[PDB]
Design a protein around this nucleic acid. Structure first.
Ligand code: MG
Ligand code: ZN
Ligand code: ZN
Ligand code: ZN
Lengths: 163, 93, 141, 628, 298, 100, 353, 49
DNA sequence: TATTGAATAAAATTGGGTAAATTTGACACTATAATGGGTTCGCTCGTTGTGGT
DNA sequence: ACCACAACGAGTTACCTCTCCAAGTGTCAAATTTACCCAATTTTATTCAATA
RNA sequence: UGGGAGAGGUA
């Protein structure tokens, strides 16, 4: 609820101080999930806390990355994700559209996890892309799909009291 | 500037420059101060901004008029401690 | 009123950046103060001409008492009465135009804060105070 | 947020295109059928931004779901409308044109940069005389300005050995072809041979300009404009009037003239127009750009339909009604009121009478905070309707908020620093501010219709500055001289003068009184007058060589009124300051002596008591004015 | 573009109150400071309290003595009207009323008009006395007026003190004022500078388009200007935080003033100031003039 | 659309329409005070300037393109007084109103 | 006198006072110079056989019955037999071009049979603009071969002009330049591949026009000086009539525009009146010029004040519905395309004809 | 109509009449102004006039 | 019994380009004679920048 | 070198109150976008096995 | 929306 409104309003940059609140809430959620996963709890307090905080910022930035991110819009569809078919409009006559072939309709270009991997491997260098793929990235897309659930339940608790 | 240059030149062992002080008027001194923002907000904004754009000046924001235009604490009164703290922070680091 | 307002604005802008940024600049320069005796009478006595200033050096005379005020003393009413009872006519006090400080003045070269009665605290906009003090009685002129 | 200095320089054409967001091509501001701005115009939403917050122009992406997309129906990026006052544009001028500041702001600095007369430079820019730029022969040295006759016969003489041009392109070619460091070393060479101070000052001015150009690192050909930047269209809005018609802005009109003449010059240049027509169009574009940058500088100012000259960008920067003096050095300010002032003769030196409706408007978010702290209001709208209906608990919370929260009272013109002072407000009925009578000298206020502004300090630091610096009890002495600004004026003065002044055979003369309390008893009972010469026993005090007060008692010869004034004179002052007829100078000397002996707080209490007894005894005197 | 206009006409009845500018015909202006009770007002030996108490210190340095002479002549006029009112309340005659009104009309030294009441009827004299019972109106021409001798003869006709000064008593203590006080009738005007029209306060309202500063005026609910001179006053005090909050959070700091409003509602008296939007406007205008000015990140 | 002069006003109590007539206009002789409504006017479907307290709530939830704005002629604050004359000037061509 | 003035309309009226007014004969012989210029460029493009085969392919392209001959030929029922005569001219200029005064008499006969073609102006300047872009292609080609002659020599290039003003097609000038052995010729062996590219370009252009380089070079020189004299006569005509522009723009002054803008739009209108002026109509110039001047000034001041092809052929031409539609109705309802629908109509006309 | 309405509406001497009392109306009608079209100018005049 | 360094498909993303749709600005619409314009001074004081002997 | 003319700028602070500020419609070449083709790269999963 | 002029007035 409050996590959903804070993360959404910090993503779309309104009341622009709840981004840090979303970082801290996702860090506490990482504290919650790190007890039931193997490769995350292999460190001490300060190091694991710092790398999970910067991983929370990276997962929130992966949630914050929209079609209005500076340097992330699709070059062809201009963010829309909808192009016209000249051939199908010629053989049909009716107005028809297709999925944008470049960005596959999502509108923008998503953020790679290897930037986060390079940003965190300057503290712990012995973890590699096998370990990053088999251990870290399930936690990473778990956080971003969880923040999607948080946004959607904020949307449901909003349209239950407004509609 | 002449006094500071003569200070450091007689410190490191040079000859130093000689000068002759000039009594500017009140308007001419306000327009010939080394803060182009203060001089432009006083008077003759066309002339002052033209000369400052040609010379490529920069205002270091050391005066009360400059820190009022910018919207900060002035270096006077209760803002003086904050301004010398900011000066030692930008000088140490 | 129009002319005095324009004069006050010119004075504030010529003196806007002057702030007491030191306690003592460490100079020996001064201004020889004297009672103005222009015309046929004394116009301003030495007591109020020097009251609140800071002496550039000692006063040196055999005189009637051989009074030796120290260097850099804030002249209160007590020291004014001392100079009156010891009959002094020329005192050298540290002025603002002979201050050794760069980008501001020292507190000793200014002297007494006329609004509070003690020495001036470092960080007081004496240029704005002086410009308003000169440009206020222009309506009375 | 974090920045140290502010730098100023000339603007390169690549930098002018770098701030831009799209080239402005058409001069239409908005369509007048529907209120929608035209594409590539002065208000174009594809260039400057959408007119609604998170909504495209044609109405295709109206939600915040698309936080930015370029709507392919109308090209508009779906973002907030705050970017309309921040995104610039640019116009690509066909012929380059001179900047009017770097031409007609004396000294011209293009004529000073090239050692050319401004008359010759304007003759070149007005397409009247050619100027050579380079020449392979020795007959035509550089900057030799030729007329049309000399240009045609030199064309029949040499033809291709030289190349002379005209207009601002010639001056841009001259500035681009000049050599900065070579002119620097040549001028530093030529400085030594001359001996006249005028020629030497000219050489030092030119070498200072050249050294300033080299040390800044700009290029001298950036004084000739090839790209012209456009102000964002929410900083030059199209305000609608009450008739349905518009009062369009002067910047929109000047940009419209510049764009129309630039587009016509593009058409005449690609149409292969005659040289006279294309020179007239280039000259007109030069005049339009110069008008837009500074209307009244070069020729006659382009006036609008109302016979008034158009406000340019320089007219928006400079002057009393310009940006600095009207909106940057002084602003308009929230949490501030204004009312007519009256007398506060019952007040103390730190108090002012503030009306209840004025204070209820000034202190409204503090009232909302106290309402939501006490739980009386559930939400902000409930607190707002509670203040809108003005409950008795709203007036009680206002009484709680007002207490120990100073306000600043200010009267214009604020000539000296005691034109703003801080006071602790007293909630009064009525609509006028009540000012203490002893601060009216420092305010230069009377009560014939003066008004004062109230200002509420919000932050804790501002409240502490008002309490510790700007409080009226904190500045008793002037900042100009050391003398007190709190002098009693004319009614206190008339009352204390009538009090202390003696008479020879008034009533109850020659008595011997036990003290000032018996003198007050005699006067209030009616057995003695204020001016009866009488003998009372005055116990006066005196500070010793240390800080302790020694007491002494004697039989003084005085009047009854001086004995009653001794009841309010504090402990530490002698009877000699009371034992004469007190005028304005004597009361001011008494207050200054009380200051120098006792300090600040007994001086403030003494000034209050002086005001009260002077008012009371001037009233009991019954002084009047008759024709006799 | 107009469908219909509805024009409503209010009608306010405005009473005097403290704050209202009142004036006489001699440049004797001023503001009502207090509306006193009639038991508190000073009164004469007949118990009639005065209506307005004016300061005599406004007379000598301003030299408008026609104020005092109008006061004396108005006292004499109201004394004559009081005698006519006493005769009309006693319902005496028409002959004594005709005699007294004629005796009051023939008092001047060499006055031009000759008002003869023998040509008057009885109902005409009764109507004249019914219009004269509230005071006898007196024409005093400019540079042709009554003198002190005429004023004192009129005051002696009306059984009034010829010096124009009576004994007044304090309404509160009951005691007598020591010196005799000038009491009379002066013509006072209510000027159009009413404190209902001058009183205006604002907390937060609407803002200008370009500068994002508050508006100006009682009509559009604007804030008071904190001008250059007031900025100099705060600079001379040293009130840097007060000056900074005048410059930013009470003014053109759009993201700072909403923070300050919510901080005040949350009971936290602390601001977070930022850059003035008018300074951003000025930077954009100097950039539009073809001059690259920019803030420098150290 | 046109702005309507009408009796119904969104989001006011019955302490506002206590002095209006059936057409939205005030009665001749009504002892109104400050803040009362003399003639109610509502904008068409779509507001004209939105407050930031609910501008974010119209952004993230959706501007309804409905729920018209209160734009009524109110008595200014601190101003009492009766109403002595009303005059309605309608444009030539349309049917006016019952009160007009 | 130049100098102490700043009013730009005053400077315009001063600088326009140099020229003089024209008599009745002045428009006649300046129009004679105009006709001389356009007939000069017409006869210099008439001798080119590429223009002849271009007008023949234009003839059997318009003979496919997709457009009427009204917007092809104005005048001289006769165009068919005259184009058969032009085809006979084509086959005689194709078979006896090999032998050499027969080429001279046949190009002289092409130029005189070219002159009676009183065709429309737009197709004519479109086709000679196709000639213009191909001679601009060979112009930048010869400019490209001059700069590749210069860019590695670093010598006085005058001797290469003396050995290059011959035929400049074979390699005899190349061997005569390298073999004589001045100090550039031994280090000028790196030009061999680009001059061989120039030789294959020369054989390519020899087979694409059947004509050498010097004759097309001086014919391009002749048409360039012809169009230069035509443009100079147009400029000398249009500079001597700006007083008419000021006299017509004298009435529209305080109607929304500044005075100089009105006379600039009038100068544009006067230039458009000069460009399409006919002198065999009795009226001198002014009654034809004033319509264009008034039209430009009033227009400026008023401005300042398959399946898809089948259904757009239905809706645009109005085939079996209630109301017909123009390009704007379908350009609103179907897609934001406006003139693209017109090119769809053109493609459908091409695919149906 | 444009000329006379421009004058009578927005000249410098076509003034919004003061009618507080009858004295204000009679004094506004009996007023003489040294300023106006072709007269003096306010900031550009001194003690001589 | 397991987690992970190296290696590798492999599809998504960046960058470049490119031929075909598609905008975009202009132009048509036309022939008695006409041929050179309307717009501010009763402001002072001072300062700085320009031109002859 | 010194004098005699032109042009800019400045002139108190607020505060108020008012009024006043013609008709689309069809056609052409160019250039501009636009849907899309394809190498370089690189991010992510997936196999081997090899230490632990 | 809320700008710019002009006029008048107050201290
Ligand atoms: Mg006053
Ligand atoms: Zn896409
Ligand atoms: Zn010092
Ligand atoms: Zn759209």
């Amino acid at each position: 609820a409050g996590f959903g409104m804070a993360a959404f309003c910090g993503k779309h940059e309104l009341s622009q101080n709840d981004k840090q609140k979303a970082i801290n809430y996702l860090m506490q959620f990482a504290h919650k999930v790190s007890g039931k996963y193997r490769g995350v709890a292999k460190l001490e307090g300060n190091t694991k806390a710092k790398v999970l905080q910067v991983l929370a910022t990276f997962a929130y930035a992966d949630y914050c990355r929209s079609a209005a991110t500076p340097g992330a819009r699709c070059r062809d569809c201009h963010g829309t994700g909808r192009a016209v078919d000249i051939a199908k409009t010629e053989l049909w006559g009716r107005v028809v559209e297709k999925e944008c072939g470049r960005c596959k309709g999502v509108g923008y270009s998503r953020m790679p996890a290897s930037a986060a991997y390079r940003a965190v491997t300057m503290l712990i260098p012995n973890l590699t892309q096998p370990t990053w793929s088999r251990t870290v990235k399930p936690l990473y897309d778990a956080l971003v799909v969880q923040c999607h659930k948080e946004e959607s339940i904020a949307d449901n608790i909003l349209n239950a009291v407004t509609r | 500037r002449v006094k500071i240059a003569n200070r450091e030149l007689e410190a490191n062992g040079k000859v130093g420059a000689t000068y002759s002080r000039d009594l500017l008027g009140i308007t001419k001194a306000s327009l010939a101060t080394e803060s182009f923002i203060s001089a432009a907000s006083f008077q003759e904004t066309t002339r002052v901004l033209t000369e400052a754009a040609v010379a490529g000046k920069r205002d270091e924001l050391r005066g009360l008029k400059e820190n009022v235009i910018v919207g900060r604490l002035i270096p006077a009164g209760t803002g003086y401690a904050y301004h010398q703290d900011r000066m030692r922070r930008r000088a140490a680091g | 009123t129009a002319n005095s307002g324009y004069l006050t604005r010119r004075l504030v802008d010529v003196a806007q950046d002057l702030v007491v940024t030191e306690d003592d600049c460490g100079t020996h320069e001064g201004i020889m103060m004297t009672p103005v005796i222009e015309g046929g009478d004394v116009k301003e006595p030495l007591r109020d001409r020097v009251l609140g200033r800071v002496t550039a050096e000692d006063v040196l005379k055999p005189g009637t008492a051989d009074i030796l005020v120290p260097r850099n003393t804030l002249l209160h009413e007590q020291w004014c009465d001392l100079l009156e009872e010891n009959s002094v006519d020329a005192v050298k006090v540290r002025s603002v135009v002979s201050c050794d400080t760069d980008f501001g003045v020292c507190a000793h070269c200014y002297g007494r804060d006329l609004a509070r009665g003690h020495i001036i605290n470092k960080g007081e906009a004496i240029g704005v105070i002086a410009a308003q003090s000169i440009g206020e009685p222009g309506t009375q002129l | 947020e974090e920045f140290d200095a502010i730098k100023i320089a000339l603007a390169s054409p690549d930098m002018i295109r770098s701030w831009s967001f799209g080239e402005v091509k058409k001069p239409e501001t908005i369509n007048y059928r529907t209120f929608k701005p035209e594409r590539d115009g002065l208000f174009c939403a594809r260039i400057f931004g959408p007119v609604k917050d998170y909504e495209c122009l044609c109405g295709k992406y109206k939600r915040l779901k698309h936080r930015g997309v370029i709507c392919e129906k109308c090209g508009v990026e779906v973002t907030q409308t705050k970017v309309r006052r921040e995104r610039m544009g640019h116009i690509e001028l066909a012929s380059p044109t001179a900047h009017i500041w770097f031409l007609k702001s004396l000294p011209s600095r293009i004529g000073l940069l090239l050692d050319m007369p401004l008359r010759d430079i304007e003759r070149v820019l007005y397409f009247e005389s050619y100027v050579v730029i380079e020449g392979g022969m020795t007959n035509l040295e550089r900057q030799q300005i030729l007329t049309e006759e000399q240009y045609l016969d030199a064309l029949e003489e040499f033809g291709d050995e030289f190349d002379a041009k005209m207009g601002a392109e010639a001056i841009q070619a001259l500035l681009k072809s000049m050599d900065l460091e070579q002119e620097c070393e040549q001028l530093r060479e030529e400085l030594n041979e001359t001996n006249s101070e005028t020629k030497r000052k000219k050489l030092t001015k030119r070498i200072k300009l050249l050294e300033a150009f080299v040390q800044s690192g700009n290029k001298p050909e950036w004084m000739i404009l090839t790209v012209l930047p456009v102000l964002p269209p929410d900083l030059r809005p199209l305000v609608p009037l009450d008739g349905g018609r518009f009062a369009t802005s002067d910047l929109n009109d000047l940009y419209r003239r510049v764009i129309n003449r630039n587009n016509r010059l593009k058409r005449l240049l690609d149409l292969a127009a005659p040289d006279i027509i294309v020179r007239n169009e280039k000259r007109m574009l030069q005049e339009a750009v110069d008008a837009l940058l500074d209307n009244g500088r070069r020729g006659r100012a382009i006036t609008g339909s109302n016979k008034r000259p158009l406000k340019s960008l320089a007219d928006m920067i400079k002057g009393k009604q310009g940006r600095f003096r009207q909106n940057l050095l002084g602003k308009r300010v929230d949490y501030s009121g204004r009312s007519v002032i009256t007398v506060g003769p019952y007040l103390r030196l730190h108090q002012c009478g503030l009306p209840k409706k004025m204070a209820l408007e000034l202190f409204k978010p503090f009232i909302y905070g106290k309402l939501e702290l006490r739980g009386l209001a559930t939400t902000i709208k409930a607190a707002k309707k509670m203040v809108e209906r003005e409950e008795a608990v709203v007036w009680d919370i206002l009484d709680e908020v007002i207490r120990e929260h100073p306000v600043l009272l200010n009267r214009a013109p604020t000539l000296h620093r005691l034109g703003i002072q801080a006071f602790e407000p007293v909630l009064i009925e009525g609509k006028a501010i009540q000012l203490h009578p002893l601060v009216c000298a420092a305010y230069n206020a009377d009560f014939d219709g003066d008004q004062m502004a109230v200002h509420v300090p919000l932050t804790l630091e501002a409240q502490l500055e008002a309490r510790a610096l700007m409080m009226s009890t904190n500045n008793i002495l002037s900042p100009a001289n050391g003398e007190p600004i709190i002098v009693p004026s004319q009614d206190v003065v008339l009352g204390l003068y009538y009090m202390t002044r003696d008479c020879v055979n008034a009533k109850g003369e020659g008595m011997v009184l036990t003290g000032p309390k018996e003198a007050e008893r005699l006067y209030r009972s009616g057995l003695a007058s204020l001016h009866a010469r009488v003998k009372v026993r005055i116990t006066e005090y005196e500070k010793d060589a240390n800080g302790e007060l020694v007491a002494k008692t004697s039989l003084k010869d005085t009047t009854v009124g001086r004995a009653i004034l001794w009841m309010i004179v504090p402990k530490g002052l002698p009877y000699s300051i009371v034992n004469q007829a007190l005028g304005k100078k004597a009361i001011s000397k008494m207050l200054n002596t009380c200051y120098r002996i006792l300090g600040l707080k007994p001086t403030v209490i003494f000034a209050d008591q002086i005001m009260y007894t002077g008012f009371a005894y001037a009233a009991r005197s019954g002084a009047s004015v008759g024709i006799d | 573009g107009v469908l219909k206009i509805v024009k409503v006409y209010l009608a306010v009845k405005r009473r005097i109150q403290p704050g209202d500018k009142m004036a006489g015909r001699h440049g004797n202006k001023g503001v009502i400071s207090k509306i006193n009770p009639i038991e508190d007002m000073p009164y004469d030996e007949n118990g009639t309290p005065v209506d307005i108490v004016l300061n005599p210190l406004g007379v000598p340095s301003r030299m408008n003595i026609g104020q005092i002479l109008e006061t004396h002549l108005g006292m004499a006029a109201k004394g004559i009207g009081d005698k006519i009112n006493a005769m009309l309340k006693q319902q005496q005659e028409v002959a004594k009323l005709r005699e007294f009104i004629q005796r009051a009309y023939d008092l001047g030294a060499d006055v031009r008009q000759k008002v003869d009441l023998s040509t008057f009827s009885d109902e005409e004299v009764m109507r004249l006395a019914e219009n004269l019972r509230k005071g006898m109106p007196i024409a005093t021409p400019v540079f042709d007026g009554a003198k002190e001798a005429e004023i004192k003869e009129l005051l002696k006709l009306g059984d009034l003190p010829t010096s124009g000064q009576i004994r007044l008593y304090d309404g509160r203590t009951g005691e007598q004022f020591e010196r005799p006080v000038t009491v009379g009738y002066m013509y006072m005007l209510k000027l159009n500078h009413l404190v209902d029209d001058k009183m205006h306060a604002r907390s937060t309202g609407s803002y200008s388009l370009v500068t994002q500063q508050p508006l100006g005026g009682k009509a559009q609910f604007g804030g008071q200007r904190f001008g250059e001179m007031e900025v100099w006053a705060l600079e001379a005090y040293g009130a840097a935080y007060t000056l900074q909050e005048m410059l930013t959070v009470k003014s053109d700091d759009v993201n700072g003033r909403t923070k300050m409003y919510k901080n005040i509602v949350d009971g936290n008296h602390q601001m977070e100031p930022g850059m003035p939007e008018s300074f951003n406007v000025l930077l954009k205008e100097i950039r539009s003039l073809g001059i690259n000015i920019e803030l420098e990140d150290e | 659309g046109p702005e309507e002069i009408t009796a119904d006003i969104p989001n006011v109590g019955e302490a506002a329409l206590s002095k209006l007539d059936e057409s939205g206009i005030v009665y001749i002789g009504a002892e109104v005070t400050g803040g009362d409504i003399l003639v109610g006017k509502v904008t068409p479907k779509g507001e004209t300037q939105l407050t930031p307290e609910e501008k974010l709530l119209r952004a993230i939830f959706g501007e309804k393109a409905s729920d018209v704005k209160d734009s009524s002629l109110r008595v200014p604050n601190g101003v009492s007084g009766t109403v002595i004359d009303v005059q309605v000037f309608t444009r030539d061509g349309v049917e006016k109103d019952k009160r007009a | 006198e130049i100098g102490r003035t700043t009013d730009p309309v005053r400077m315009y009226m001063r600088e326009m006072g140099t020229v003089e007014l024209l008599t009745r004969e002045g428009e006649i012989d300046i129009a004679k110079r105009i006709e001389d210029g356009i007939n000069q460029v017409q006869c210099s493009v008439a001798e080119y056989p590429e223009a002849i085969t271009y007008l023949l392919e234009q003839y059997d392209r318009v003979e496919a019955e997709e457009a009427r001959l009204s917007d092809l030929i104005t005048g001289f029922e006769l165009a068919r037999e005259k184009f058969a005569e032009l085809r006979a001219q084509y086959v005689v200029t194709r078979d006896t071009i090999k032998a050499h005064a027969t080429a001279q008499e046949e190009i002289l006969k092409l130029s005189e049979v070219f002159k009676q073609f009183r065709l429309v102006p737009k197709q004519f300047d479109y086709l000679v603009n196709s000639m213009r872009v191909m001679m601009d292609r060979v112009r930048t080609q010869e400019r490209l071969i001059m700069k590749l002659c210069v860019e590695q020599c670093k010598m006085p290039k005058k001797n290469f002009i003396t050995l290059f003003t011959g035929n400049e097609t074979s390699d005899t000038w190349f061997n005569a330049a390298i073999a004589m052995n001045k100090p550039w010729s031994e280090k000028l062996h790196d030009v061999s591949e680009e001059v061989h590219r120039a030789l294959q370009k020369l054989q390519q252009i020899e087979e694409e026009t059947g004509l050498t380089i010097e004759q097309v070079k001086d014919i391009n020189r002749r048409m360039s000086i012809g169009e230069a004299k035509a443009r100079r006569a147009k400029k000398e005509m249009v500079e001597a009539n700006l007083r008419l522009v000021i006299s017509i723009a004298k009435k529209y002054t305080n109607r929304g525009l500044q005075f100089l803008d009105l006379i600039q739009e009038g100068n544009i209108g006067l230039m458009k009146a000069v460009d399409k002026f006919e002198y065999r109509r009795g009226y001198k110039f002014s009654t034809y010029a004033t319509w264009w001047i008034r039209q430009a000034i009033t227009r400026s001041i008023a401005d300042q004040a398959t399946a898809r092809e089948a259904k757009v052929l239905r809706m645009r031409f109005g085939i079996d519905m209630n109301t017909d539609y123009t390009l704007e109705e379908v350009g609103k309802q179907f897609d934001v395309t406006r003139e693209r629908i017109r090119q769809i109509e053109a493609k459908a006309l091409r695919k149906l004809r | 109509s444009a000329a006379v309405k421009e004058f009578f509406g927005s000249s410098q001497l076509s003034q919004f009449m003061d009618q507080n009392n009858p004295l204000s109306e009679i004094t506004h009608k009996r007023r003489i102004s040294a300023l106006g079209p072709g007269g003096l100018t306010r900031e550009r005049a001194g003690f001589e006039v």
